[PDB]
Amino acid sequence: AKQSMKAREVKRVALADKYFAKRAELKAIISDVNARWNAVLKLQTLPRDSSPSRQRNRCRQTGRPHGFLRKFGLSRIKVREAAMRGEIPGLKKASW
Amino acid sequence: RRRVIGQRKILPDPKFGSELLAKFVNILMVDGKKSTAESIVYSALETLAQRSGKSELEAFEVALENVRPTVEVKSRRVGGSTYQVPVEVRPVRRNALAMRWIVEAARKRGDKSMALRLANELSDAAENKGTAVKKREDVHRMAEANKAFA
Amino acid sequence: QDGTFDKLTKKEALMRTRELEKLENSLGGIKDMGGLPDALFVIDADHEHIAIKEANNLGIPVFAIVDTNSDPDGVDFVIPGNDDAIRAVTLYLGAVAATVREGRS
Amino acid sequence: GQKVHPNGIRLGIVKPWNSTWFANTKEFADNLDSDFKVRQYLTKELAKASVSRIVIERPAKSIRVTIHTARPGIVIGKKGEDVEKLRKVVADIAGVPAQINIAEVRKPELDAKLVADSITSQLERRVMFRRAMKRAVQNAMRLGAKGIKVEVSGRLGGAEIARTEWYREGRVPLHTLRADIDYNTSEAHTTYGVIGVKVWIFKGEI
RNA sequence: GGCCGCAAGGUUAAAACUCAAAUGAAUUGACGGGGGCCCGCACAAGCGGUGGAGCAUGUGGUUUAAUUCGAUGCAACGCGAAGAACCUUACCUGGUCUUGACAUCCACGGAAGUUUUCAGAGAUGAGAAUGUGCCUUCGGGAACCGUGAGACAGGUGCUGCAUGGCUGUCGUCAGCUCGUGUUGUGAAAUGUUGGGUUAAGUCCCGCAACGAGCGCAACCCUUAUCCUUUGUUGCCAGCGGUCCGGCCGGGAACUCAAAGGAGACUGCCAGUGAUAAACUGGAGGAAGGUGGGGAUGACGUCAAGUCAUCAUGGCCCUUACGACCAGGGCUACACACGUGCUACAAUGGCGCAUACAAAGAGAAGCGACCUCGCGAGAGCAAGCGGACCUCAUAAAGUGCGUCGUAGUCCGGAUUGGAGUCUGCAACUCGACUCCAUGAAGUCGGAAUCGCUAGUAAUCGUGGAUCAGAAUGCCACGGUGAAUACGU
RNA sequence: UCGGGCUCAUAACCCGA
RNA sequence: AUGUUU
Ligand SMILES: [Mg+2]
Ligand SMILES: [Mg+2]
Ligand SMILES: [Mg+2]
Ligand SMILES: [Mg+2]
Ligand SMILES: [Mg+2]
Ligand SMILES: [Mg+2]
Ligand SMILES: [Mg+2]
Ligand SMILES: [Mg+2]
Ligand SMILES: [Mg+2]
Ligand SMILES: [Mg+2]
Ligand SMILES: [Mg+2]
Ligand SMILES: [Mg+2]
Ligand SMILES: [Mg+2]
Ligand SMILES: [Mg+2]
Ligand SMILES: [Mg+2]
Ligand SMILES: [Mg+2]
Ligand SMILES: [Mg+2]
Ligand SMILES: [Mg+2]
Ligand SMILES: [Mg+2]
């Protein structure tokens, strides 16, 4: 969580919606056997604080960078806590 | 504890017909591979044939008679001291005790295949010898030597 | 009795019907009552002493037969007799019917 | 935790959800946020509005909602004024032009959160928690209720040690599935701490 | 001190100083190496394990610039962490900032932006051109960009003895209480004790008790049956067709799917038993005596755990305990412990061929097909958003070649050289493949754990988290035991 | 003496060197 | 045997 951190992460997100949003391949094709130079691969200093592998999740509701659920977005605490009330359609406590 | 049960029997001999015999196949069976147990408890008698001759059916029980005990002891604590009071075991567990001790030594033969490591002890009983038959009378030692109890 | 036990299979009845079974037997003479006594008259005074415990409190008239071992304290209306006497068991008991209905009208 | 959430294991029977629609790994994600976002801003303002629940649906590229307020009047204001203003909040915090509406809640003194948020405020209002919860809260009983109760938290009053008060009437067997009980909470930030509330309102079994 | 005595000592009998009590009876609970009674894999009866070995993972210690923090008998130690190369990330060394990285707001300039240049590790700083949005009763304003200034903002900073919320714990234990009445000066008691009985404060009987609330028993799930309907992607029986492939038509019969039901209730039979409850056998049935497995965890105790999810009382930091970037560390090691994985082998290993499940997964996804590659995989590219396709080629098992009890035809650690890929990026610190090397180890002391049946045991399969690193967790089925006198 | 076990934990006790 | 620790 920590607003100061949350925001610090938000940056790591927008950057993808820019550089990686398209220019990510603008050099990719020139990276794999598609002859083929190295200049682009060499002057490759565009994606720094930006990387499609440096973005964390953090409980959507809160912001815990652990115990995340793709199908949702929150962490065990919120999810369970919320599901209890019913902010999630069809999510009754499982018990085969 | 406060409840009582009966017994858990199962499918008897695949053809020779023998409920208890199954135990020899189960007790010996390991990793829940009964499919292989029948491959050892059956093939065993198929080898003792020339060995003994007469129906392998009797062959088993025959020597088996010289392996089954008939009196054991159970630790019972009293006033600090825990006596080893003796007790004559009924047939039910009797025959069982044998099979356990029987299959055990057989797997301690330390030779090659179990098929043979099993027959050896299956006949070693009658002729007398081996670890299996050992326990038989070995138990008798502790027995009576404590008759001063029960 | 009324069309209410008709619910639940032929078995449930026994459950609620058994409940009443005891109730009636214990709460025999009271069904009509709905307030308090006025002058209770017990039979085996001594033995049924605990049944007078409540009487001595309020002050409701208490009459009852007291043998030789009875407790002539709780009962404020002395009248010995015999908690037994299979035949004399109703004797003094009958002299009550008169006092009641056949004595008030 | 000895007792679990009496409302959690109830979404199946005798108790409805709060956000019935549809969504997959794709939408469910953004959807989980939406239902949240709204209920956040909506409540803050609909506070004095006496809310009981906030249902949320979604037919297509738009949310439905159903502000369960004990007095939607305040939510209206100058007749449409208030409502309209907020009707835009959702359309922007939902990403799509969503509908709107309400359904006043009568007998508010017999509703979980409503009664909960009720006894939680009296605190800051300078009242005696005990003399309050055992009175200006149990009122539900008066309404021919079958059973109800409330279990406060710690730091009650000027105490420096957390605790918990009893006081309860009727029967609240939070074990019977059919039973059905209304549960909710409210962290009434106390001038010197943060006490909690737990209202158990059981209205008939199945 | 006096008196008595052979003596040992007796008899008479103080004070200083010190404490706020000492003490009697009785009540509640607790405990006992007190008694009676009764349960739970507690033991007993069995099977298989741990400590042995190597490795994985956590921890203590130790070390370090840091080895971020919390978790500690059971009830911490593959725990928070369902996923630490960067990121994460809190810790460190250094570079750098000071109404801020994130908020609102006031004022000024400029639509926002665009792509690039140089220098830097980057954080940035200074530029070069370009872009010229919404309205305006023309100032002004809406967003927004930079700056100025503050009110403020920021803190995974400390108190889990200030707290919420959440959870562990005995304990799935059968208990825990309350109102009224009554007994006692009272503290309390009764109920709730007792006789049977039950898995059960379960039920009946009795009784100064009468009733009731929370809890056990039910309704929820799911499985075991049978029916109804629906029959596509699922099904294939009688019919033919057939490239002989449920492949065609076709048929709705079957499994199956999945919504609604049927059913089990001491319900009925006998005995026992107070002709009470209940128990023990029986029938019928797929199913018997809460059918099996889930979920559900009473009043409470351990000031039990978590201010680090988040929230929050107080307290504290305020060119900083705030903030941004690059590298390092959490992946140290001279040791110790916990939970695990793999073997030590012929109920086995390796080569051949072969026999069959269940449940889930998926558009920045699962990715067939065919080509090349010893190989990881790379290329090509269809199909399926899915009872339509891809994951999917179950493993044990079975029948043969064999090897012969060798540290080996076992076992695989370790290491060297060469490669693949996921990624800016894999030295520090990644998963896999290729060849070469082949470890310790031959069944493990004191001690210690799990498991009563589809269980234990073994063998595989899928999911979650997730760019890319599961001996972990969650879940699925295949096969498939022993043993239980008794406390 | 040390390393491990036993106990809630010590000593003692048991194991190993 | 003890635990403010045989
Ligand atoms: Mg914060
Ligand atoms: Mg990541
Ligand atoms: Mg005393
Ligand atoms: Mg059990
Ligand atoms: Mg044992
Ligand atoms: Mg052993
Ligand atoms: Mg790091
Ligand atoms: Mg502040
Ligand atoms: Mg605590
Ligand atoms: Mg702590
Ligand atoms: Mg403490
Ligand atoms: Mg009861
Ligand atoms: Mg239950
Ligand atoms: Mg704080
Ligand atoms: Mg770590
Ligand atoms: Mg996957
Ligand atoms: Mg995985
Ligand atoms: Mg001492
Ligand atoms: Mg000392």
Pick out the nucleotide with least CA–C1' distance to A55: E87
Among A62, A73, A54, CA closest to A3: A62
Beta-carbon separation of D18 and A87 below 8 A: yes
> How far is Cα D63 from Cα D56, in angstroms, rounded to an integer?
7
Interface of A with D (CB under 8 A): 60-61, 70-74, 83-93
Is residue B52 within 8 Å of B122, Cβ to Cβ?
no
> What residue spans define the domains of chain A?
1-86
Longest dimension (CA), chain C: 56
List domains and CATH numbers for chain B. Answer: 19-142 (1.10.455.10)
Query: b/e string for A5-25 if b means 16 or more Cβ within 10 A?
Result: eeeebeeeeebbeebeeeeee
C42, containing H or E segment: strand C41-44
> How far is Cα D35 from Cα D17, in angstroms, rounded to an integer?
13
Residue A28 CA to ligand 7 centre (angstroms): 27
Is residue D136 within 8 Å of D119, Cβ to Cβ?
yes
| Closest CA in chain D for residue A91 | D11
| Closest CA in chain A for residue D34 | A87
Query: b/e string for B46-73 if b means 16 or more Cβ within 10 A?
Result: ebbeeebeeebeebbebbbebbbbebbb
| Closest CA in chain D for residue A73 | D29
The end-to-end CA distance of chain C, in Å, is: 33
What subunits touch chain D, counting only 3 or more CB pairs under 8 A?
Answer: A
Query: Coil, strand or helix: which one is A90?
Result: coil
Among D112, D123, D118, CA closest to D136: D118
- Which amino acid does the sequence have at B148? A
Pick out the nucleotide with least CA–C1' distance to A49: E87
Pick out the nucleotide with least CA–C1' distance to B74: E44
CA D154 to chain centre: 21
Is residue D199 within 8 Å of D192, Cβ to Cβ?
no
Query: b/e string for D46-72 if b means 16 or more Cβ within 10 A?
Result: beebbbbbbbbbbeeebbebbbbbbbb
Q: Which nucleotides of E are covered by protein (CB under 7 A)?
A: 38-48, 80-84, 86-90, 101-103, 114, 122-123, 154-156, 161-171, 182-183, 205, 208, 212-222, 265, 267-268, 293-301, 303, 309-314, 322-326, 346-347, 362-364, 378-379, 396-399, 404-405, 422-425, 453-454, 456-458, 464-468, 475-476, 478-487
D94 phi and psi angles, rounded to 5 deg: -115, -20
Query: Coil, strand or helix: which one is D67?
Result: strand
Helix locations, chain D, DSSP H: 27-46, 73-76, 81-93, 112-124, 129-133
Q: Which are the contacts of C93, defined by CB distance < 8 A and separation ≥ 6?
A: C43
- The torsion angle over the Cα atoms of residues B51, B55, B56 and B61, rounded to 10 degrees, is -110
Residue A88 CA to ligand 16 centre (angstroms): 24
D35 interaction partners in chain A (CB closer than 8 Å): 87
Residue B14 CA to ligand 3 centre (angstroms): 77
| Distance CA C54 to C1' E27 in A | 28
A78 interaction partners in chain D (CB closer than 8 Å): none
D186 interaction partners in chain A (CB closer than 8 Å): none
> How far is Cα D164 from Cα D154, in angstroms, rounded to an integer?
6
Pick out the nucleotide with least CA–C1' distance to A41: E424
What is the pairing mode between strands D181-185 and D66-69? Answer: unpaired
Resolution in units of Å: 3.2
Find the CB nearest D32 among A74, A84, A85: A74
Find the CB nearest D36 among A83, A87, A91: A87
> How far is Cα D72 from Cα D83, in angstroms, rounded to an integer?
9
Beta-carbon separation of D32 and A88 below 8 A: yes
Starting from the CA of residue D161, give the closest ligand: 9
Do A and D touch, counting CB pairs below 8 Å (3 needed)? yes
Among D202, D198, D151, D152, CA closest to D174: D202
Beta-carbon separation of D18 and A85 below 8 A: yes
How many CA atoms are closer than 13 Å to the CA of D69, on its beta-carbon side?
21
Find the CB nearest D36 among A61, A71, A84: A61
Query: Coil, strand or helix: which one is D25?
Result: coil
Residue B95 CA to ligand 10 centre (angstroms): 60
What subunits touch chain A, counting only 3 or more CB pairs under 8 A?
Answer: D
DSSP string, D147-159: EEEE---SS-TT-
> How far is Cα D73 from Cα D76, in angstroms, rounded to an integer?
5
A61 interaction partners in chain D (CB closer than 8 Å): 36
Query: b/e string for C61-84 if b means 16 or more Cβ within 10 A?
Result: ebbbbbeeebeeebbeeeeebbbe
Find the CB nearest D8 among A70, A84, A90: A84
| Closest CA in chain D for residue A60 | D33
Beta-carbon separation of D32 and A91 below 8 A: no
- Which amino acid does the sequence have at B135? K
Task: Specify burial of residue D3 (Cβ count, 10 A radius: 0-12, 13-18, 19+).
Answer: exposed
